[PDB]
From a paper:
All NPPs share a conserved zinc-binding catalytic domain (phosphodiesterase or PDE domain). NPPs hydrolyze pyrophosphate or phosphodiester bonds. In this extensive study, we determined the crystal structure of NPP3 from Rattus norvegicus in complex with a phosphate ion and various nucleotide ligands allowing us to characterize the substrate recognition of nucleotide triphosphates, dinucleotides and nucleotide sugars by NPP3. Similar to NPP1 and NPP2, the structure of NPP3 consists of two major domains, which interact via a large interface of 1279 Å2.
Crystals of NPP3 diffracted to 2.4 Å and contain two monomers in the asymmetric unit, which form a small interaction interface (536 Å2 as calculated by PISA33). Thus, dimerization of NPP3 in the cell is most likely mediated by interactions of the transmembrane helices analogous to NPP129. The two monomers in the asymmetric unit displayed no significant differences and superimposed with a root-mean-square-deviation (rmsd) of 0.165 Å. In the active site of NPP3 two Zn2+ ions (referred to as Zn1 and Zn2) are coordinated by D168, T206, D326, H330, D373, H374 and H483, which are strictly conserved in the NPP and alkaline phosphatase enzyme families. In addition, a phosphate ion is coordinated to Zn1 via one oxygen atom and it is also hydrogen bonded to T206. Zn1 exhibits a distorted five-fold coordination geometry, whereas Zn2 is coordinated tetrahedrally. The side chain of N227 is in hydrogen bonding distance to another phosphate oxygen, but the N-H···O angle of 113.4° indicates a very weak hydrogen bonding interaction. In the nuclease-like domain, an EF-hand-like motif comprising residues D752, N754, D756 and D760 coordinates a Ca2+ ion. At the domain interface, a glycan chain at N533 of the PDE domain forms a hydrogen bond with H758 of the nuclease domain, which coordinates the Ca2+ ion of the EF-hand-like motif. Additional glycosylation was clearly identified in the electron density maps at residues N237, N280, N289, N574, N702 and N789. Additionally, a disulfide bridge between C429 and C818 stabilizes the domain arrangement.
Author numbering: 140 to 146, 151 to 474, 477 to 579, 588 to 652, 658 to 684, 688 to 871
């Protein structure tokens, strides 16, 4: 097989191509980029088949949360396996890989691919995979093996080939095979070591035995084989360890130590909810200038991580820096580990695919492991269970896609807010000491002109039932006003390539918006008002008046407004120069229950004092330009370049530690730490973007799932 050149070529009885999901634990993307030529079997798969630059794992980058994510398409908060070691307060049980509780189905939520195949008339086999030796939803796969880590790889491969030799009626359609290396070697001596080289060659021989076994059965060009990893590997040192004793004079709490720490009470289940979580994060915040970890309350963690909505995820969390560790006390730390931020290059996992359904000799852009489940369903010709993947985003991997995606259906239509009188019925206790409202009255030609410039990819669609809203048109921007919350859901504007300050003490009522559906300036006097669209970004002094209205007002904390004003005055201009103009879509996010979805009116717990106007938990800023920098965002036919942000709307800037530090040293870093996907913004707002962009839905889904890295 290895000496043979590159290639459904299926034999008798094989009507549909079988699927083999091979996992090599801790096989980082870096190993494939550097040591490929040392691994002849994996290098042939890299040359002949399809492979991604890297595959992004889920946070924490651990074995059990990631392996269960690949087979369910769910974030650990949804499937329940948030760590290899965890505690459930309601069950009052401890989960560990050594305990009998690992076999307890009460911990395993969602629907793994082996169950989905069995429920839809197909047989599924498994030679190791977290959850496959567990009766998930009262059922085990057709053929499974109870975990035994030391069984030689040659035996694992031979048993898998015996399953493929079974008669058509007994023979499974889906297979999973798991291997411990190069993770074990990575933990012992680190990612760049001789032990890792030996472990990589060991997994190459194991994969070689499988491919040679398939070659003998003439299934080498029939089977749709996927070779991936759960996470990556990074180097650790005992000199690179942070101790909690250096921050607390007496530790009375329990800590899940390592690269992704969690802090809870010792007295469980009695004091679990009464435990002062905010006191612990406060006592660990900005303690030292060179602190190698960042304490967070789970709702304050970057939203792209999706690591909060589960009782097993303790409120106190620590974001540990690259190559560092966090322990309770000095007491292992040598070699290497994983569990860190999934954005870190060292945590990136491999992804390779070969078969008749996959594209030959293709290098695909990086993607997330939450997307694998829908792809597995497509290969198996089965309907996927509700997951967090975007069905159709991985269609560019398949020769002939099984599923065809479509744009999300708008559940609410725009109505009202038409220009009637240029005089306001209610002043709304607003004042401008400096007829101008005629600029707000746009004709069909003027409306089409602002739609062409400020809405080049079409208006964001409202994917919310009974959401009373209207579209407000201006010469420099277009906004979608949410009537019930008295503020806009989104504000869209295309800043041109640049080559003035905001008008002070001037604010008036919007003549188009009804007084009962608009904010009053007196509401903020009794947290201050902020402008969603920056009034001074486009046009001149007279152009500013179109933005110095009540409909452009959003509730903002004084400390958050410092980051917001700096971003639109300094950072936004810098980005507009770099990408030859930029289309900006900004708006509020309400997620008080921290489920990663837009809040219902009854879910919002904080409002502006004495009023029904809600306080946003986050603010989104989606920057869209074109890949080809010769064209502007408003006039471009090709692929787009996106940079979305989901910045938490917090009363303090404690997350940045900005004491005695100028805004040019911490604002950009804070925005960069809260970068998300367009899909993350879409889930948190109940909006759908780029529906009028002339491109297939599968291609737009790639842009929506894309995560910009720095
Ligand atoms: C995996 O191990 C479990 C035991 O931990 C096996 O489960 C037993 O299966 C027999 C089947 O005759 C039952 O009588 C027992 O009651 C089961 N015990 C438990 C605790 O569930 C299981 O069969 C093993 N799987 C394989 C494929 O070897
Ligand atoms: C789960 O494991 C923890 C230890 O990690 C156990 O916690 C102890 O709980 C008692 C009260 O039940 C406390 O007095 C101890 O201080 C706790 N120890 C630590 C180190 O936290 C817990 O009991 C275990 N629960 C079960 C059901 O096994
Ligand atoms: C990830 O997908 C899961 C499954 O579709 C989502 O979880 C469901 O959320 C709804 C509404 O909160 C619940 O009624 C269901 O019971 C949940 N199902 C499961 C299996 O937990 C989850 O919200 C999605 N996450 C994101 C961020 O979109
Ligand atoms: C659990 O199994 C039942 C059938 O016994 C099925 O209807 C249900 O959808 C399954 N649930 C999940 C989450 O897979
Ligand atoms: C960018 O667009 C110009 C035309 O405006 C074209 O000549 C050029 O080839 C394009 N670049 C790429 C990389 O496609
Ligand atoms: Ca929510
Ligand atoms: Zn692992
Ligand atoms: Zn490991």
């Amino acid at each position: 097989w290895v000496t043979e050149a590159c290639a459904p070529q299926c034999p008798e009885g094989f009507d549909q191509p079988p699927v083999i999901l091979f996992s090599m634990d801790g096989f980082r993307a870096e190993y494939l980029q550097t040591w490929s030529t040392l691994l002849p079997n994996i290098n042939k798969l890299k040359t002949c088949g399809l492979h991604s630059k890297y595959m992004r794992a889920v946070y924490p980058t651990k074995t059990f949360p990631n392996h269960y994510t690949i087979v369910t398409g769910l974030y650990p908060e949804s499937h329940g396996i948030i760590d290899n070691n965890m505690y459930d307060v309601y069950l009052n049980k401890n989960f560990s890989l050594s305990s009998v509780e690992k076999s307890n189905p009460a911990w395993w939520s969602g629907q793994p691919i082996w169950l989905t195949a069995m429920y839809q008339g197909l047989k599924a086999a498994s030679y190791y995979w977290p959850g496959s030796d567990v009766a998930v939803n009262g059922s085990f796969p057709n053929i499974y093996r109870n975990y035994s880590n030391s069984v030689p790889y040659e035996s694992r491969i031979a048993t898998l080939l015996q399953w493929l030799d079974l008669p058509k009626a007994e023979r499974p359609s889906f297979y999973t095979i798991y291997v411990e290396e190069p993770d074990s070697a990575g933990h012992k001596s680190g990612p760049v070591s001789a032990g890792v080289i030996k472990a990589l060659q060991l997994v190459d021989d194991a994969f070689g035995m499988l491919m040679e076994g398939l070659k003998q059965r003439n299934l080498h060009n029939c089977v749709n084989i996927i070779v991936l990893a759960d996470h990556g590997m990074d180097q650790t040192s005992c000199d690179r360890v942070e101790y909690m004793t250096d921050y607390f004079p007496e530790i009375n709490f329990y800590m899940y130590q390592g690269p992704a720490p969690r802090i809870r009470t010792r007295n469980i289940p009695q004091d679990f909810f009464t435990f002062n979580s905010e006191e612990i994060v406060r006592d660990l915040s900005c303690r030292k200038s060179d602190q190698h970890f960042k304490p967070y309350l789970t709702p304050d963690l970057p939203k792209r991580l999706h690591y909060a909505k589960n009782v097993r995820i303790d409120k106190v969390h620590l974001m540990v820096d690259r190559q560092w560790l966090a322990y309770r006390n000095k007491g292992n730390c040598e070699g290497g580990t994983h569990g860190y931020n999934n954005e870190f290059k060292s945590m990136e996992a491999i992804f390779l695919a070969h078969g008749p359904s996959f594209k030959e000799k293709t290098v695909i852009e990086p993607f997330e492991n939450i997307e694998v489940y829908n792809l597995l369903c497509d290969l198996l010709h089965i309907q996927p269970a509700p997951n967090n993947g975007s069905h159709g985003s991985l269609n560019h991997l398949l020769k002939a896609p099984f599923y065809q995606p479509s744009h999300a259906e708008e559940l609410s239509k725009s109505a009202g807010c038409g220009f009637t009188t240029p005089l306001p019925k209610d002043s709304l206790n607003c004042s401008c000491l400096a007829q101008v409202n005629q600029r707000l009255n746009l004709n069909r030609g003027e409306v089409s002109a602002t739609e062409k410039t400020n809405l080049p990819f079409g208006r964001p669609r409202v994917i919310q039932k009974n959401k009373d809203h209207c579209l407000l048109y201006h010469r420099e921007y277009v906004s979608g006003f949410g009537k019930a919350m008295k503020m806009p859901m989104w504000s869209s504007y295309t800043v041109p390539k640049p080559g003035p300050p905001t008008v002070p003490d001037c604010l008036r009522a919007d003549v188009r918006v009804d007084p009962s559906e608009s904010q009053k300036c007196s509401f903020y006097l009794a947290i201050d008002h902020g402008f969603l669209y920056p009034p001074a970004i486009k046009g001149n002094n007279e152009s500013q008046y179109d933005a110095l209205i009540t409909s452009n007002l959003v509730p903002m904390y004084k400390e958050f407004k410092k980051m917001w004003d700096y971003f639109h005055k300094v950072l936004l201009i810098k980005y507009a120069i770099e990408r030859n103009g930029v289309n900006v879509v900004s708006g509020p996010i309400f997620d008080y229950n921290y489920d990663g979805h837009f809040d219902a009116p009854d879910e919002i717990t904080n409002y502006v004092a004495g009023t029904d106007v809600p306080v946003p938990t986050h603010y989104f800023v989606v920057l869209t330009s074109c890949k080809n920098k010769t064209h502007t965002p408003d006039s471009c036919p090709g692929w787009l370049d996106v940079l979305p942000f989901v910045v938490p709307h917090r009363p303090t800037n404690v997350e940045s530690c900005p004491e005695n530090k100028a805004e040019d040293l911490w604002v950009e870093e804070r925005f960069k730490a809260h970068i998300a996907r367009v899909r993350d913004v879409e889930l948190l707002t109940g909006l759908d973007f780029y529906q009028e962009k002339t491109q297939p839905v599968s291609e737009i889904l790639q842009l929506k799932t894309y995560l910009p890295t720095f």
